[PDB]
RNA sequence: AACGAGACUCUGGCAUGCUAACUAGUUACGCGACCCCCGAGCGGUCGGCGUCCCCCAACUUCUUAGAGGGACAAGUGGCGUUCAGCCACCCGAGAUUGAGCAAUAACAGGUCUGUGAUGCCCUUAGAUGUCGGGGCUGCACGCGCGCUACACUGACUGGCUCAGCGUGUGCCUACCCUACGCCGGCAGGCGCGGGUAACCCGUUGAACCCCAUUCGUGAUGGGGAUCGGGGAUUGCAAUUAUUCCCCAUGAACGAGGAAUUCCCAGUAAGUGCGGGUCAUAAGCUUGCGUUGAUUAAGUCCCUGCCCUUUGUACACACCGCCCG
């Protein structure tokens, strides 16, 4: 056991990544196992250094948004903790693999740039894939829980779940495939 | 309550839609000749020629007849178009 | 805006549904019971605590912000 | 009207084209026959060597 | 649990029966929330039962406290009307006593045409606020002739 | 960054080598002391940059001749 | 007032108020027509 | 075990439950009709708030033996929301902080030390550490 | 509060590496230092980051007040 | 050859090396004292907690602040006409910290209301050189810098635990920061000490945050405008309410059209705290810390800037000139 690390509870070493394009850009196994999603981490000092950042910490940073959350990070860690604890119930599966699935199945593998409304189609770099997937599924949650009785942990959990199996009931998937159809038309 | 003998409109049909929100790369519009499954019209497909302001063509709450081009009969993606209509169809 | 109707205390039908919903769920939070039933939410909390006092449910994590339960830690 | 996905590996970065200099010119292999090669235009920050994904390997974009 | 009547009509206003009793009786004018907690505390009532869970005799115990606060030992610095200008009494005006006491106060002011009476008349701001860029109810005017 | 030595750093380092060539070896920390002894550089920051160009020029002069 | 002396007969109800409180220092406003600078659109003369 | 060995919240709950188990420690008459500071907006929920407040006060005296009322009102200060203007830091109530320290001297737990201020008597510290051990043994700490 | 968790977390491990290095052999502390520095740096090397100083013109260090042209 | 750039001056980051400290400390024990067994033990001894009291003990890690040291594209590998230099990497406290200072030539820029700097003009005893009152706050309306919000990533009520830059008795002038006791629900009042300041306020018990309770999608306990009544402090004087406290009243506002501002790392934003003005007194501004992201490593498209070539009927210079 002491050679191996957990977010208190969840194991990393049983994870798998099936998109060989994203194996360089999602950090979860091995030297990227940390006990908490909270490190000082001067990541945003050089260009690609953001790729080394453990994926759960990236999921936390992208969550404290819209003004009256800027900076409040300990709330974000206590949100993520609860979200995973709910996910393990709603499935009975490992929470980290579900997160890795919901990131892989949300990166739009083609987008349309603007040239002149005249657009053109282009393919997205493997880093932008994950950078967009994170944004999308954290906006889905923040949006689903703005005036409902549900709690942000509940909505983030069911968002990760409904996305890890592309279901058209999740904001992320809808927006991704809708961003791809617009590219498909003006190919 | 359903209007017609098929709940999902077929390709090449002209439909009555009430535009509801002008999107960033289209508009999210209701469906009023079929039940209210959403529709998305691409902004490249309002008119055949250059436009000065979108509010002069479409604005929230205006019944209009548009032609569907493609649809994922499974997932629910109704792709809609307005360049491709004659006023007789209307 | 609409009128999300909710009760503050149970009627017999709803009380039956509570003592029978326990196995149906693998996620028991105040919010989900307050939405699947027509419960205010300050009532869902009290009812869930009452059930927990009957060993009918198992508390998996309680926080100041969010509470959770589980089905039976069985099956 | 039906084509499988293709996976290419970036082998060289040429320049940053587009009107605001947003997209990037890049030359890719094909990971099943490393003989093939095309020039593509990507949107994110490509490095070198990472696996793109093409939804229509037949095109070959030539400017902005 | 407890499926008897909930709504109650305390004096001249419909107190909804659902809300917690503290936040239930606040639907009376002149009775904010800080005063209500004191009334309920001096009434010995539980503070975890809604308005529907009180019988017909506790409610009188609460009313008589709201009406005669000075005698149930609620100090003279809680009452909203103090050394009343016309007769020196101290009390909480409750429901229409509030309306009439505001009405009488504005009449009292206008009668001797004090600078506040005229401001209440002309419909302006009575305290010392600037009025050049505020309030601003009316309609736009054009420079054309 | 920059790192383009100014002409007041590329003229000291040229006179010094002409006068004292047999002291200026090939490491930087000894040159940083020789230069401090021979000339009067009125700063630490300037002294180091001068003694850092001296080493470049020394490495180059252990090949063919330089034209200054 | 600032220029006139305004008479005031004293009533008993004036008790405890201030004297100046019965003699206002200005005419109440009623507006004219907006002038040539009134709106951000209004400015132009050839 | 001393007091620093145990979780400083359940210790407070234990000390309050013990203080309100002796019949001593007279409480002021206005205990139920008081805001508790200039910046609050409501009266405390817990009907026994005086007992909790005295418990925490004694604990705070234990950890820093020279308080006086002018810091009990700072130890208890908070943030005032000035309506439509920015908030600002605001002190506690002098009068209840004073009556709390006076009520503790009646239990011989507190005494006015040299210079000026207050500290716990030798007999007060025992009363504390005893329930500290009680807590550590109940929760197994 | 948080900036003291890292002070503590850095100080104790910077200690177990200097109690070894002084009263144990040298080659035993090279084990500690590499079990440590390979997992997370800044358990031995302090962050050099400190707040930058505000300037006139803006609310903080780099922002500026709004500019109303017309 | 001269100026500007750069160099330079201040500041932030590193020294367990030096200098040396009752106006900073730490460790030790000389201690002793309190307390609990909390562990061996029993309760002392072995130990544990101490901003409890000492030392004419030892020292300078933490604190303070002086002298020097350190970083140079210096080492290694690529690209460079093998030059000037660029890119990645190693060792490292650090391989780009932030400011101040700044040229030639100009502008009909601002300031005669900073000046006992000042030409000319005006008024000069029925004053344009003093006291009492009013005004600069007046409200149909158009705009600018902002503050608080539209809530559940929340509001309320308790509980727990952390800073940094600073100022402080006033020379006419006449006032300073506050400990500790007592009285009052609160603002506040009386009493009696310290401070001309690393000495006292002060170990500056700061807010957000952190932990636990009530509410439940409802303009609701969100929000806190407007208005009634009452109680204090400043001052010669508070009405057109100086400021402050309490009970009460409970509006618009459910993320904002066309447009448009600022911003690259301890930065944006959230959060409070000192300085200035200040008899009383920040929704301002100037600084300080505290929790601390997303996106970029680019381009000349838009708005502008610098250098070369080219065209001109412009030179008050395209906001030009000019035809019927
Ligand atoms: Mg706020
Ligand atoms: Mg800031
Ligand atoms: Mg420097
Ligand atoms: Mg320093
Ligand atoms: Mg000490
Ligand atoms: Mg120095
Ligand atoms: Mg080389
Ligand atoms: Mg290194
Ligand atoms: Mg610099
Ligand atoms: Mg210049
Ligand atoms: Mg002048
Ligand atoms: Mg003059
Ligand atoms: Mg005079
Ligand atoms: Mg005068
Ligand atoms: Mg003015
Ligand atoms: Mg301005
Ligand atoms: Mg609070
Ligand atoms: Mg004023
Ligand atoms: Mg300020
Ligand atoms: Mg002052
Ligand atoms: Mg001030
Ligand atoms: Mg000002
Ligand atoms: Mg140039
Ligand atoms: Mg020419
Ligand atoms: Mg020419
Ligand atoms: Mg000419
Ligand atoms: Mg002209
Ligand atoms: Mg022209």
UniProtKB/Swiss-Prot annotation, chain E:
Transmembrane segments: none annotated. GO terms for molecular function: rRNA binding; structural constituent of ribosome. One of its GO terms (cellular component) is small ribosomal subunit. GO terms for biological process: translation. There is a cross-link at residues 86, 89, 101 (Glycyl lysine isopeptide (Lys-Gly) (interchain with G-Cter in SUMO2)). InterPro entries: Rbsml_uS13_C, Ribosomal_uS13, Ribosomal_uS13-like_H2TH, Ribosomal_uS13_CS. PROSITE patterns: RIBOSOMAL_S13_1, RIBOSOMAL_S13_2. It is found in: Cytoplasm. Component of the small ribosomal subunit. The ribosome is a large ribonucleoprotein complex responsible for the synthesis of proteins in the cell. HAMAP family: Ribosomal_uS13 (MF_01315). Component of the small ribosomal subunit. Belongs to the universal ribosomal protein uS13 family. This is Small ribosomal subunit protein uS13. It comes from Oryctolagus cuniculus. The lineage of its organism: Eukaryota, Metazoa, Chordata, Craniata, Vertebrata.
Swiss-Prot record, chain F:
It comes from the Eukaryota. One of its GO terms (molecular function) is structural constituent of ribosome. GO terms for biological process: translation. It is found in: Cytoplasm; Nucleus, Nucleolus. One of its GO terms (cellular component) is ribonucleoprotein complex. The modification N6-succinyllysine is found at residue 19. Its main location: cytoplasm. The keyword Ubl conjugation applies. Keywords: Cytoplasm, Isopeptide bond, Nucleus, Phosphoprotein, Ribonucleoprotein, Ribosomal protein, Ubl conjugation. Component of the small ribosomal subunit. The ribosome is a large ribonucleoprotein complex responsible for the synthesis of proteins in the cell. Part of the small subunit (SSU) processome, first precursor of the small eukaryotic ribosomal subunit. During the assembly of the SSU processome in the nucleolus, many ribosome biogenesis factors, an RNA chaperone and ribosomal proteins associate with the nascent pre-rRNA and work in concert to generate RNA folding, modifications, rearrangements and cleavage as well as targeted degradation of pre-ribosomal RNA by the RNA exosome. Component of the small ribosomal subunit. Part of the small subunit (SSU) processome, composed of more than 70 proteins and the RNA chaperone small nucleolar RNA (snoRNA) U3. Belongs to the eukaryotic ribosomal protein eS17 family. This is Small ribosomal subunit protein eS17. It comes from Oryctolagus cuniculus (Rabbit). The gene is RPS17.
Swiss-Prot record, chain H:
GO terms for molecular function: RNA binding; structural constituent of ribosome. The modification N6-succinyllysine is found at residue 140. Keywords: Acetylation, Cytoplasm, Host-virus interaction, Methylation, Nucleus, Ribonucleoprotein, Ribosomal protein. The modification Omega-N-methylarginine is found at residue 64. The keyword Nucleus applies. The modification N6-acetyllysine is found at residues 20, 108, 112. It comes from Oryctolagus cuniculus. Its main location: cytoplasm. This is Small ribosomal subunit protein eS19. Belongs to the eukaryotic ribosomal protein eS19 family. It comes from the Eukaryota. One of its GO terms (cellular component) is cytosolic small ribosomal subunit. One of its GO terms (biological process) is translation.
UniProtKB/Swiss-Prot annotation, chain I:
One of its GO terms (biological process) is maturation of SSU-rRNA from tricistronic rRNA transcript (SSU-rRNA, 5.8S rRNA, LSU-rRNA). Keywords: Acetylation, Cytoplasm, Nucleus, Phosphoprotein, Ribonucleoprotein, Ribosomal protein. One of its GO terms (cellular component) is nucleolus. Its main location: cytoplasm. GO terms for molecular function: RNA binding; structural constituent of ribosome. Component of the small ribosomal subunit. Part of the small subunit (SSU) processome, composed of more than 70 proteins and the RNA chaperone small nucleolar RNA (snoRNA) U3. Belongs to the universal ribosomal protein uS9 family. This is Small ribosomal subunit protein uS9. It comes from Oryctolagus cuniculus. The lineage of its organism: Eukaryota, Metazoa, Chordata, Craniata, Vertebrata. The gene is RPS16.
